[PDB]
Structure formats: C-alpha cells, structure tokens
Amino acid sequence: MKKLQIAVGIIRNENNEIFITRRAADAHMANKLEFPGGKIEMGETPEQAVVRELQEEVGITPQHFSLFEKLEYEFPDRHITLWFWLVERWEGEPWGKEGQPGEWMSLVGLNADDFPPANEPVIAKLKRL
Ligand SMILES: Nc1nc2c([nH]c(=O)n2[C@H]2C[C@H](O)[C@@H](COP(=O)(O)O)O2)c(=O)[nH]1
Ligand SMILES: [Mg+2]
C-alpha cells in the first residue's frame, strides 16, 4: 500500500511569531509555505519520529515541544499522516534541514493557499483560529 507519515512543529519565535519555510530565502517555490519536521516517516516511532527529525529539521537548541494538533487522513488510494506539534521558543536561527529557509512570521495569518492545498485539513482547523 501507499502510505507516508509527516510530523512537524511550528517553531515559536521571540515575538509570538513562528518561523516556517515560506517561498524559501531565494528560491522559486513560492507555494512551499510549510513547516519543519517532515520526513519523520522514514522508520521512527510516533514519538521519536518528530523528536528525532526535530534535530534534523532544526539542528538548533530551542525550547520546543508539545503538540498543537495531529491528524491522519488517507487520500483515494493514498495515505498521508500529518502531525502538527507546538513550539514555544528557539535560540538563534533554525537550520536543521527542513528544506527552504524561512522568516519569523505571525502564525495568526497562516497561508493555506501558499502551502499545499491538499494539506489544508490541518490548517483548516487553526486557520479559522
Ligand atoms: N496522501 C497524500 N499525501 C500528501 C498530500 N499532500 C502532501 O504534501 N502529501 C505528502 C507529500 C510530502 O512528502 C509530505 C509532506 O512533507 P514533505 O513535503 O516535506 O515530504 O506529505 C495529499 O494531498 N495526500
Ligand atoms: Mg526531515
């Protein structure tokens, strides 16, 4: 079967703003407004998957932990698990290896349009704030 897991955590900055990968720092993918922690799927545990990938997607030392929301849905012949974790702080700039560098933005205005549309089920909840 076709199934893939994803665990992410919105890093909280020093100004109630979270650092998320958006249009990279100088890339073309402007609709890549996503978060770190992806790839947890690999072969980790529901708990170590994020905690492990966290170091891989942050590399820094941030007071980051707890989950904000987690959901598991499967598309017509596809299985996508998206876990959203809550973060409270992060020292310096987050690097790890998420993919496309981001900037400290206000999560109160998340972009469900810029980020993957099929991945709205998660944002549809928080987006409505
Ligand atoms: N089944 C399913 N998987 C999806 C959808 N959208 C989406 O990004 N995914 C997948 C692809 C990605 O690899 C992953 C999210 O993190 P990455 O883009 O970093 O891999 O989940 C979808 O609509 N259905
Ligand atoms: Mg990763």
From Swiss-Prot:
Binding-site residues, 8-oxo-dGTP: R23, H28, E34, F35, P36, G37, N119
pH dependence as annotated: Optimum pH is 9.0.
UniProt GO molecular function: 8-oxo-7,8-dihydrodeoxyguanosine triphosphate pyrophosphatase activity; 8-oxo-7,8-dihydroguanosine triphosphate pyrophosphatase activity; 8-oxo-dGDP phosphatase activity; 8-oxo-GDP phosphatase activity; magnesium ion binding; manganese ion binding
Entry's Gene Ontology BP terms: dGDP catabolic process; dGTP catabolic process; DNA repair; DNA replication; nucleotide-excision repair
Binding site for Mg(2+): G37, E57
Phenotype upon gene inactivation: Disruption of the gene increases the rates of A:T to C:G transversion a thousandfold over the wild type level.
EC number(s) from the headed UniProt entry: 3.6.1.55
PROSITE patterns named among the record's database cross-references: NUDIX, NUDIX_BOX
Domain Nudix hydrolase: from-to ranges: 1-129
InterPro entries: Mutator_MutT, MutT-like, Nudix_hydrolase, NUDIX_hydrolase-like_dom_sf, NUDIX_hydrolase_CS, NUDIX_hydrolase_dom
Source superkingdom: Bacteria
Catalytic activity, as annotated: 8-oxo-dGTP + H2O = 8-oxo-dGMP + diphosphate + H(+); 8-oxo-GTP + H2O = 8-oxo-GMP + diphosphate + H(+); 8-oxo-dGDP + H2O = 8-oxo-dGMP + phosphate + H(+); 8-oxo-GDP + H2O = 8-oxo-GMP + phosphate + H(+)
Residue interval(s) of motif Nudix box: 38-59
Pfam families referenced in this protein's UniProt entry, alphabetically: NUDIX
Keywords for this protein: DNA damage, DNA repair, DNA replication, Hydrolase, Magnesium, Metal-binding, Mutator protein
Gene3D superfamilies in alphabetical order: Nucleoside Triphosphate Pyrophosphohydrolase
Cofactor(s) this protein requires: Mg(2+)
Subunit structure: Monomer.
Function as written in the Swiss-Prot or TrEMBL entry: Specifically hydrolyzes both 8-oxo-deoxyguanosine triphosphate (8-oxo-dGTP) and 8-oxo-guanosine triphosphate (8-oxo-GTP) to the related monophosphates, thereby cleaning up the nucleotide pools and preventing misincorporation of 8-oxoGua into DNA and RNA. It prevents replicational errors by removing an oxidatively damaged form of guanine (8-oxo-dGTP) from DNA and the nucleotide pool. 8-oxo-dGTP can be inserted opposite dA and dC residues of template DNA with almost equal efficiency thus leading to A.T to G.C transversions.
Annotated family: Belongs to the Nudix hydrolase family.
Protein name, as recorded: 8-oxo-dGTP diphosphatase
Lineage of the species this protein comes from: Bacteria, Pseudomonadati, Pseudomonadota, Gammaproteobacteria, Enterobacterales
